[PDB]
Amino acid sequence: AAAAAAAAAAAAAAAAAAAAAAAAAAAAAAAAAAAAAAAAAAAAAAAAAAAAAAAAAAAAAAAAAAAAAAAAAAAAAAA
Amino acid sequence: AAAAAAAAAAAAAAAAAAAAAAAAAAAAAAAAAAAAAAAAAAAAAAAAAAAAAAAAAAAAAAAAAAAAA
Amino acid sequence: GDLLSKTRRLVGGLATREPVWLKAMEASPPPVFPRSNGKIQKIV
Amino acid sequence: RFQTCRLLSGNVWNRELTIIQRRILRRLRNRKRSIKKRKIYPKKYLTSYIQLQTTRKLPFFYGDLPITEMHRGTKRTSYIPFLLNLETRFDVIPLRLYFLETIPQARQLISHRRVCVNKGMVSITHFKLSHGDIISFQENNAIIRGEEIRRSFYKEILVEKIIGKLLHQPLRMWRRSKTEWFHLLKTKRGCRLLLKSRFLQQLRSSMQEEDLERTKKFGSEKVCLGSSFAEHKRMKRNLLKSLFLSKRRISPIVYNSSLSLYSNSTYCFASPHKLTMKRRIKRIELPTHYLEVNYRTPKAVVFYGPNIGHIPHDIRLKDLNLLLWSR
Amino acid sequence: VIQKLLNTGAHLGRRAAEHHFKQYAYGTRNGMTIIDSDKTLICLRSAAHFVANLAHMRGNIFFVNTNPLFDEIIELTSRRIQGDSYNHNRAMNLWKMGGFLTNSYSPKKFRSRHKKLCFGPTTMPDCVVVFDSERKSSVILEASKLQIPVVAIVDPNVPLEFFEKITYPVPARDSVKFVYLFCNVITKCFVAEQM
Amino acid sequence: GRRILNDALRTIVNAERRGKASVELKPISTVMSSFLRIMKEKGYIKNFQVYDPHRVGRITVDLQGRVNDCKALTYRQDVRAKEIEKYTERTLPTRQWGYVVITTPDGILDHEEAIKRNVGGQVLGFFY
Amino acid sequence: ERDDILLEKLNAIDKKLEIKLSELDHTFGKKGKRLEEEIRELAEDRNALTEKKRQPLYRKGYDVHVIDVKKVCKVTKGGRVERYTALMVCGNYEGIIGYAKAKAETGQSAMQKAYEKCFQNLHYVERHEEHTIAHAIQTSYKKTKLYLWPAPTTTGMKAGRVVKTILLLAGFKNIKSKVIGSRNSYNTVKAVLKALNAVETPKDVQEKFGRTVVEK
Amino acid sequence: IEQDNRQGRAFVDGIKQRMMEISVLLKQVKEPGARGSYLKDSEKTEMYRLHKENPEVYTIERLAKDYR
Amino acid sequence: AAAAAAAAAAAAAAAAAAAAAAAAAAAAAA
């Protein structure tokens, strides 16, 4: 797939960067909303960044992909 | 895309070099995320300032008495 | 502390730097069994 | 007295260090204070040595009362009579904290002269006053010490500091004559306003910079980083993805700007405290846990009591973590 | 299950009563004691996993043996496998003895290499794996000193001063079959593992 | 307080730090059954099945493995309700914890339940 | 640089392993013509290999905590032998406290000969709120006993000397403590160690159910 | 053109020396639970003016929370 | 050209890294 591999490379790069960043964003958001109080803050945050806390975010993104694909496809098949 | 593969080896070079040389983010990320999310005042302003005071100690002491010197 | 948790508390309180067997040590705990009394039953 | 500084192996704030005193302090401070405090590890009760040094520093600071005796009066160790006498002993603490020499200059003042509180003379010299106390000189005190506090706030915070920080390193016998000249210039109540408006703007900018230095000391850059976590990643995204989009799939000046501003991002958010400094002058730490003065004519009612981390200690946090075992 | 059939065929669960532990014995048969072979297998699971994980950081291992009945079974390993050093495998052949594992950076310079070996290699083994009865005690002591984990075969015969400061005990109990292939399990491990 | 009580408690403690997990005590009692249960639902043990309600005497206690020194008092003494705040300072860890056990007319308490109900009685045991 | 010199020393020792393995595996034949090189390169291996365990003496194998010292004068009587024993305690004000004990032939030499071993065999103490200890506790060595009671934040350290210079640079500020029995030194050390390591903080007491509140 | 938007915002960040200083003041505010200012006495005579004229609206809550 | 810019990024970034590394090596003296 000459001249086309770097394209998928950039797509994966952008998607992964945004995805993991939004992941830890949601993790620390849930924390700071509930307690994230004093040192449980550093605990949960570095857990989000070293432990995954991002695999579930990407699974929610893939769920969004499948659901919205189904919606757009059934719409276009209503045509 | 083998020229792009050489560029991507260059990109891996920039990335690994940045990380293992100048990354300085393991907990300052969390600390300042809270600092900015503290962009306003409420009955969660004293809570915020005290959480910042009592989570800056871990970073300061950890760094200055952890390693590398 | 025990040989498995002493070391964790040590490295966590940042006493010494990490050993090269820690991630695997925790990943394969030791085979504990229910604490039972004496009386090895004579089985027949 | 300077002899006490010689004993304390350092500088107990003798005034007007004559030339051979300059010599002897350089000798003593460097050689002795180093050699003892630098690398010894003695069993020579370094804890108790420190204890002596601090319990000897503090009494001159508060004139001449014995502070071991203050400790002993209560059955505690410390920090309570400290926060107390500093809540006020009413001449040695407040009159110096604002405008005087805590020594029998600021003493004997309450003995003979007056500083009426709530217009009430309190001539006891050891009063404790807090929570709503108006501190006011008399008028025949004012008609002199208005000028005295002006010549203090300027000759001793503008003039001396400004002949310091500059004109300094090669020759001090020269800062001598430069102080003569700037004395002739401060003689002038128009020079006052012109100096208020002079290039001190530049020195204040440089001071902002040096405070930024002592700030980056312990992670100001790390919190700047965390607070702008995306933005650098956004710059990297610009660079790498515009790379894998425009080419290898205006590009050259896209790379120009991306390189410049991105490398500058990383530089400014990871420059680690090149201190290397020659010396460090000291600020005057005015009390705003106590309320200010009508500096025009002294009317300086208090509004609150003091804390423990905002006190003029001539001692580092150590040895006072041995005296005041505080966080 | 079938593996339990195989262990039971392996003349292993049964061994005379010289015991300090009883968390293990299924019973006794007056000349043997029957340990819980499922616990045997579970211990193997844990420890073999631990070694196959330590692999994923490739930390030196340095087996130990002194009873040369396993010599051949073991020597099929530790050379081109695990540590990979056949020359060190020769140290192991004739080692455990001297100033050991804590004064490892000893001189030991004097050879006069007349019908002697005198290897003295030196590097921190991040885990230890032994199997013999008791002469090797120095390795256990010094590992417990310097916080090195150990895998060890323990029979009913083990004093508390070992049975409690050795982690990962494989209570295998070699018995009437004497030495039989075991190490071929750890041979499976670490090879076709490191990917 | 009796001495069969002290006996039950010390047999518990010694079996614990010996390392067995299930024991049996012959001379049983109501004040002892109550105390086993109190320890239980405060956490310190696992099951306390008493067997013979009358006339014989046998308990089988199966244990967790917590600290449990728990000396059982012998020489009686009063305890009001407002004196525990200072008297339960003479346990082993004076400040943090241990439950001085008190007996009441309203059932055998510990010092938390006591200072809540504002009832008194007499001390019986300690906890550490 | 640390890893650079480490693997570099490893290059040295690997050429050592190579040539000395070769020479060993040549057992068979005439003797001298290999043993000369044997002695040379093995002596070289010594000089190089011992420098790893040399390193801990000054620069690394040396953190930035602070240390304090003890010392006495033991004896042997072959003639009138005299030597010196000495103790050291490392602490970092956050609580990592460790110690060490070793002997030498003169004071500063013994102080030294421990000054680079205090940094091994480290035990980590858990100072509750950065100023004091978690509770009261008794703890005894052979015949020295010890009692630890906290104090609210403003009293200060009420302890002796050998115990003060440990609770100080462990990071405590408001402990009161009573050591009783033997008034010896090296038992108060290791008594403080057998004591502070005995405190079970609420994190510990969550060894069973129950989140233990602090009373706010 | 997205690229030049990007370069504009990257320049925006590059000229953000000041963010170091807002972080300065906000961590100082962190330090003792206090606020990093003087009021410079212009605010003090200003608030005296404000309240003197308006001792009806400018409570010592309005005023003192204005000037913190 | 863009490959020249990629290696240019590697160049400038490794340059900055080494410069600050030596900077710390010098700041460790005092």
mmCIF file of C-alpha atoms in Angstrom, chain D residues 274, chain I residues 17-27:
data_model
loop_
_atom_site.group_PDB
_atom_site.id
_atom_site.type_symbol
_atom_site.label_atom_id
_atom_site.label_comp_id
_atom_site.label_asym_id
_atom_site.label_seq_id
_atom_site.Cartn_x
_atom_site.Cartn_y
_atom_site.Cartn_z
ATOM 1 C CA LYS D 274 20.131 28.234 36.218
ATOM 2 C CA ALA I 17 18.129 18.173 25.432
ATOM 3 C CA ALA I 18 21.928 18.029 25.486
ATOM 4 C CA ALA I 19 22.201 21.757 26.207
ATOM 5 C CA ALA I 20 19.954 21.551 29.257
ATOM 6 C CA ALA I 21 21.665 18.311 30.317
ATOM 7 C CA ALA I 22 25.043 20.029 30.403
ATOM 8 C CA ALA I 23 23.342 22.988 32.080
ATOM 9 C CA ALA I 24 22.283 20.722 34.940
ATOM 10 C CA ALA I 25 25.717 19.082 34.961
ATOM 11 C CA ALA I 26 27.143 22.546 35.618
ATOM 12 C CA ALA I 27 24.457 23.564 38.111
#
